[PDB]
Amino acid sequence: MTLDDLAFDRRHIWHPYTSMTSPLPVYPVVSAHGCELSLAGGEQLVDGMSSWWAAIHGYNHPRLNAALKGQIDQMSHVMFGGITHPPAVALCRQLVAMTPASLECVFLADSGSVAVEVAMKMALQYWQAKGEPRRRFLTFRDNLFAPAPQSRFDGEWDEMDMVPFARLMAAHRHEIAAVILEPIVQGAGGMRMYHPEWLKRVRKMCDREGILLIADEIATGFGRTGKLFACEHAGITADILCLGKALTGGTMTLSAAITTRTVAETIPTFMGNPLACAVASESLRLLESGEWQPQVAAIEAQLQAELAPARGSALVADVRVLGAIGVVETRRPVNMAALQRFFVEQGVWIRPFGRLIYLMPPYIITPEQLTRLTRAVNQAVQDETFFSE
């Protein structure tokens, strides 16, 4: 990477959540290995982000690499219209086998958002097919927005938390096609965390009304909260389960909606992409050993222990840990340039956002690597200069 390359990127390449008139500095990553990113200048960074959830096996994994290369040798891609192929069948067999018995029909898609859109369309066609059309969705913050439950996710449950959902349900039961939620951890909602009893109660209220439950586990799935699927924290199963990110080991995009036979019965170039299916199958094979379970429990326990002192910082509003996820929510938004520089100069890759400094490291991270991550977070939230007003 050259100085001109960085000028070109700055002037011509959009990055997430940044402007093009006043972009923030970006760091040139040229390669990656293990739990580390290699900068163009040669600096190594301990990754604390898993490239946002997905890179649970780390970077440059030999088995993911070999799966990709082996599929390339046969075919990178063929259309799925009127055609099926070994990678799609192998992947769907794994997805059906590893999910609860009732989840058995797989709709492959490119991206997480498309799999959620597909789930919602399934819910629309379900009710249309049943002679009872329903067009509204209920989600948590003409759609219906219920507030988040207040009870601390790892503490005691107050039944009063369900009143706004219950009253919305009582008022609109017959118009609601589906409830859509992320189980426990709100990867799309400020990394907030909800009590599992809330999820248990939503499932029961849906059961009572015949309403479909759509679980978005694109962020939570595949072991990240300490359960293979985060729905397990409440003991419930969704009618439609949406999956992605760690599905491919974070090598390339792929997603899936898995539903029941009752939904499926009552019911374009890259759909089923062989290359992505082959690497996702290898990513799932890595999970089959069960090693992710003591890995994530060890990460969870270290995160609890090394982030607990952040609760003592006047700038910290909350610390919340679940599985291989540690969130420090601050009282004031971060100074993005200054704080990101500090992290890189400390040899760690941690990408904060607004009032959030959070860790979601790859499952293969070492204790010492993780301590580097939590050390930097604790140092950050003790200094005002890393925070605007």
Scan residues 241-270 and list those touching its own copies (CB under 8 A). 244-245, 250-253, 264-265, 267-270
**Residue recorded with tokens 């192998």:** 90
Q: 211 and 176 in contact (C-beta within 8 Å)?
A: yes
Q: 260 and 239 in contact (C-beta within 8 Å)?
A: yes
* Residue (2 or 289) nearer to its own copies, CB: 2
The stretch near its own copies (CB under 8 A) out of 86-94, 156-164, 193-201, 365-373 is: 86-94
37 binds its own copies (CB under 8 A): yes
155 binds its own copies (CB under 8 A): no
86 binds its own copies (CB under 8 A): yes
Minimum Å gap between C-beta 389 and its own copies is 23
How many other CB atoms sit within 10 Å of the CB of residue 382? Answer: 15
**Residue recorded with tokens 């190594």:** 44
Among 123, 206, 276, 324, the residue binding its own copies under the rule CB under 8 A is: 276
Q: 281 and 91 in contact (C-beta within 8 Å)?
A: yes
Q: 363 and 57 in contact (C-beta within 8 Å)?
A: yes
Residues from 183 through 222 that contact its own copies (CB under 8 A): none
With CB under 5 to 8 Å by kind, the binding choice for 81 among its own copies, Na ion, none is its own copies
Structure token digits, residue 381:
């939230």
With CB under 5 to 8 Å by kind, the binding choice for 362 among its own copies, Na ion, none is none
**Residue recorded with tokens 């909350």:** 318
* Residue (63 or 173) nearer to its own copies, CB: 63
Among 44, 60, 262, 371, the residue binding its own copies under the rule CB under 8 A is: 60
Does 245 carry a binding-site annotation? yes
* Residue (89 or 308) nearer to its own copies, CB: 89
Q: 68 and 278 in contact (C-beta within 8 Å)?
A: yes
* Residue (57 or 372) nearer to its own copies, CB: 57
* Residue (66 or 308) nearer to its own copies, CB: 66
Q: What Rg, from alpha-carbon coordinates, does the chain have?
A: 22
* Residue (50 or 99) nearer to Na ion, CB: 99
Angstrom distance (rounded) from CA 59 to CA 360: 14
CB hemisphere CA count around 322 (13 angstroms): 25
| Strands 105-109 and 255-259, bridge-based pairing | antiparallel
The stretch near its own copies (CB under 8 A) out of 5-13, 224-232, 302-310, 315-323 is: 5-13
With CB under 5 to 8 Å by kind, the binding choice for 163 among its own copies, Na ion, none is none
Angstrom distance (rounded) from CA 182 to CA 171: 23
Residues from 74 through 113 that contact Na ion (CB under 5 A): 96, 99, 103
Residue 41 phi, psi dihedral angles, 5° rounding: -70, -5
Residues, the chain: 389
Angle between helices 367-380 and 336-345 (to 10 degrees): 150
317 binds its own copies (CB under 8 A): no
14 binds its own copies (CB under 8 A): yes
Q: 36 and 59 in contact (C-beta within 8 Å)?
A: yes
Site size for Na ion (CB under 5 A): 3
The stretch near its own copies (CB under 8 A) out of 18-26, 195-203, 289-297, 373-381 is: 18-26
With CB under 5 to 8 Å by kind, the binding choice for 99 among its own copies, Na ion, none is Na ion
* Residue (196 or 272) nearer to its own copies, CB: 272
Write the secondary structure of 197-216 as one string of H (helix), E (strand) and C (coil): HHHHHHHHHHHHHCCEEEEE
Minimum Å gap between C-beta 152 and its own copies is 25
How many other CB atoms sit within 10 Å of the CB of residue 20? Answer: 11
Q: Residue 274 belongs to what H/E stretch?
A: helix 274-288
Minimum Å gap between C-beta 173 and its own copies is 27
Q: Which residues are annotated as a binding site?
A: 52, 112-113, 216, 245, 268-269, 351
Q: Which residues are annotated as a binding site for pyridoxal 5'-phosphate?
A: 112-113, 216, 268-269
